[PDB]
């Protein structure tokens, strides 16, 4: 008796939170509990949805008396699985103790056993060699009918052990529990608001509660809406009182909540703020100082984003579908990195080269191992599930089979994807970006003729033929690039030198390079066909090779005072160290 | 085994983690080190601090031979522990320390030797030497985090072929007398 706690008795002394919503689920439980056979209900719900809370709600309803007369005198108990198991040394002790309780319970009629996480004891093991033997004592109770046992499980566990074993599923009904809508969630917090304000004497504004639920779902993708929401409010109450020791401010604002979610989110506070107005205007300017050159693309890209993120547009269509074209190995890819960094989203670099083969296309829309793991998920499907609000950086789109393109059509129009696993992903907030490298290949392609003929092709021409016009119809906008500038390439040497010089600062080394040498080195590394792809390698090669030999023992160890300048006759940089 | 010996003496002398643990493989010579440590002490080729020490070795089979009645194992083991703390200079070299983890308690009482010795080790009044294999240490000894915290693991490895020939020459007289034969230096190599 001491193992299991009497929830109904607890309600009299308090500690039972009021139940907001889920009345239909509660009625189903009352309806099924009144059955002669198969009355035992089951709560198939995901973690954090509040399935355990409705069980306590039944105890509150009974003591209150707003239930049928037959159940008015009924009692509910919450089996403490951890208590019995912890005390045991070897199997057989738990079964004996459980048998004693069940007999004591059967003596008194109208006794309900709420076995939270029933799947743990019923089967699937993998805890301490498995505790599947506990199912033995559960089947008689179901068949006997003397007592009604409420169960809490999950969709994954239910199908794995319950649906397979008819003995349990036949004597167990199903009450599907689904996460409540955003509208229902704020109402739930309002019902629980009195407890928190009376706890430490602070008021909660309606603005903050609405902000808490929307921010958590947008950022916290690893927890459900009802449970994680309470933590945000509870964390805010603690943080609000404890942090400002000097000033005790009871009033809370939406900005205060942003800092609370920042800690668990581990993302900058400014990015965490849900300010579409402020972010849209500054996003364009933010991309200018961070990334210099080809600024025209930032202007067109940003204004197009404003049209879709305005809110009027139906979000069934992906937020962004910009299909970049023209030269590659340019700041186009860099822009996405900084765009993902400013927002804080995780950039996913999906390369089609690996998925060129037709069979490999299934990896995106199917479990890659093709095993019975039943938890791997598709590469594209699970990646969107992990980060529903993150951009997908499509790479090497040219080496893609037609079936690969077919999958893209679904997300652009349907906004949902179905795979072998069967898990549904949300593409409302996802962004999509592509890159076309076909143009670069044609530029270096030789011509079969006596004299080579110049081919100054344009980015537009390739997509007309290689890609079906159907894709262009759905496409929102296409950007083009030619080259950044002659001067910017010289500046690219300076930008790399800034990070390279920052490296020297750690070593307490100082180095200077000639302005003329910087220009020539930039030209040597930069190429029209290859763009800036090889520029990174040449920068390090110029100085890393000579400096490495003397850094171990030499003047570089203390101050450096290095001098770098080219030779006119040899066009080779010279290194001199003055400590 | 001069280096391995140093580590044990150092572990015994330090304030905390006084109990060393000679982890190794079967046949490496971990038991000989403990048995050889006492031989070194009587010979006198050890520091003055350890010269006065007296190493003891516990046989679990004899301890469990007559523990038929209730409290027999507890009184015996507890009695022996009292002797160690009063002297303050003795060391109980118990081989196969993993065995005592579940020994001494048939059922109900669950008074295992590991639990009984644990408190005394916390203070550090008694120092002991253990021996276990890698597989046994991880599978059984590592489970008992309390005991592992008190003991300081020592990694032992088979000696080099050069060291082995010296060992054979040192031990050659013992086997030469028993078998009444003379082993050549070329044969041992």
């Amino acid at each position: 008796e001491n193992f299991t706690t009497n929830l109904n008795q607890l309600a009299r002394v308090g500690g039972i939170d009021p139940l907001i919503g889920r009345e239909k689920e509660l009625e189903r439980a009352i309806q099924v509990l009144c059955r002669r056979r198969k009355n035992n209900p089951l709560l198939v719900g995901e973690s954090g949805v509040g399935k355990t809370a409705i069980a306590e709600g039944l105890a509150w309803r009974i003591v209150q008396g707003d239930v049928p007369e037959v159940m008015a005198d009924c009692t509910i108990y919450s089996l403490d699985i951890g208590s019995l198991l912890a005390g045991t040394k070897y199997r057989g002790d738990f079964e004996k103790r459980f048998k004693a309780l069940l007999k004591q319970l059967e003596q008194d009629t109208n006794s309900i056993l709420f076995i939270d996480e029933i799947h743990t004891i019923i089967g699937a093991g993998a805890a301490s060699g498995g505790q599947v033997d506990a199912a033995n004592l559960i089947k008689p109770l179901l068949s006997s009918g003397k007592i009604r046992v409420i169960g809490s499980t999950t969709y994954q566990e239910f199908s794995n052990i319950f649906e397979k074993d008819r003995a349990l599923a036949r004597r167990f009904q199903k009450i599907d529990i689904t996460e409540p809508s955003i509208e229902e969630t704020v109402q739930i917090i309002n019902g629980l608001k009195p407890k928190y304000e009376a706890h430490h004497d602070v008021r909660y504004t309606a603005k903050a509660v609405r902000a808490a639920v929307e921010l958590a779902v947008k950022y916290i993708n690893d927890r459900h809406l009802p449970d994680k929401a309470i933590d945000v409010i509870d964390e805010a109450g603690a943080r609000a009182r404890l942090m400002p020791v000097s000033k005790r401010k009871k009033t809370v604002n939406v900005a205060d909540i942003e800092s609370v979610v920042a800690r668990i989110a581990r993302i900058p506070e400014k990015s965490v703020s849900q300010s579409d107005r402020d972010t849209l205007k500054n996003l364009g300017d933010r991309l200018k100082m961070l990334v210099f050159g080809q600024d025209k693309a930032i202007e067109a890209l940003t204004e197009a984003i404003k049209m879709a993120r305005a809110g009027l547009g139906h979000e069934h269509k992906p937020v962004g579908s910009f299909l970049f074209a023209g030269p590659t190995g340019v700041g186009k890819t860099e822009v996405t990195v900084q765009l993902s960094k400013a927002l804080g989203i995780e950039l996913l670099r999906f390369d089609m080269s690996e998925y060129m083969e037709r069979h490999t296309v299934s990896r995106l829309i199917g479990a890659p191992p093709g095993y019975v793991g039943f938890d791997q998920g598709g590469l594209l499907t699970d990646a969107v599930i992990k980060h529903p609000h993150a951009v997908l950086l499509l790479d090497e789109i040219e080496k893609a089979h037609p079936d690969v393109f077919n999958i893209l059509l679904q997300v652009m129009d349907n906004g949902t994807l179905t795979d072998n696993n069967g898990r549904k992903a949300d593409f409302r907030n996802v962004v999509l970006v592509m890159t076309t490298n076909a143009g670069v290949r044609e530029t270096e392609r030789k011509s079969i003729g006596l004299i080579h003929q110049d081919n100054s092709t344009d980015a537009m021409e390739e997509i007309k033929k290689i890609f079906t016009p159907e894709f262009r119809n759905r496409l929102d906008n296409i950007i083009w690039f030619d080259h950044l500038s002659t001067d910017v390439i010289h500046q690219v040497v300076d930008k790399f030198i800034v990070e390279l010089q920052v490296q020297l600062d750690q070593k307490g080394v100082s180095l200077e390079v000639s302005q003329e040498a910087r220009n020539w080195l930039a030209e040597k590394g930069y190429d029209r066909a290859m763009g800036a792809r090889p520029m990174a390698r040449v920068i390090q090669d110029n100085l890393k090779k000579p400096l490495a030999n003397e850094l171990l023992f030499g003047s570089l160890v203390d101050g450096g005072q290095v001098t770098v300048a080219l030779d006119k006759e040899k066009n080779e940089l010279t290194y001199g160290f003055q400590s | 085994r001069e280096k391995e010996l140093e580590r044990a003496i150092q572990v015994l002398c330090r304030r905390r983690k006084n109990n060393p643990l000679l982890v190794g493989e079967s046949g490496v010579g971990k038991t000989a080190i403990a048995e050889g440590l006492a031989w070194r002490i009587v010979q006198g080729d050890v520091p003055e601090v350890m010269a006065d020490c007296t190493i003891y070795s516990l046989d679990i089979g004899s301890l469990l031979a007559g523990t038929k009645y209730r409290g027999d194992f507890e009184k015996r083991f507890k009695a022996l522990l009292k002797q160690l703390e009063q002297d303050t200079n003795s060391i109980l070299f118990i081989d196969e320390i993993h065995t005592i983890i579940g020994a001494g308690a048939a059922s109900g009482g669950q008074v295992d030797a590991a639990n009984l010795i644990k408190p005394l080790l916390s203070s550090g009044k008694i120092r002991v030497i253990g021996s276990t294999t890698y597989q046994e240490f991880s599978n059984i000894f590592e489970k008992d985090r309390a005991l592992a915290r008190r003991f300081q693991k020592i990694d032992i490895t088979e000696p080099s072929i050069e060291e082995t020939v010296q060992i054979i020459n040192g031990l050659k007289p013992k086997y030469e007398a028993h078998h009444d034969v003379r082993y050549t230096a070329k044969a041992v190599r």
Partner: peptide
């Protein structure tokens, strides 16, 4: 499982 237990009689 199937484990053997050794009893202890009272002195």
């Amino acid at each position: 499982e199937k484990v053997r237990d050794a009893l202890k009689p009272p002195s």
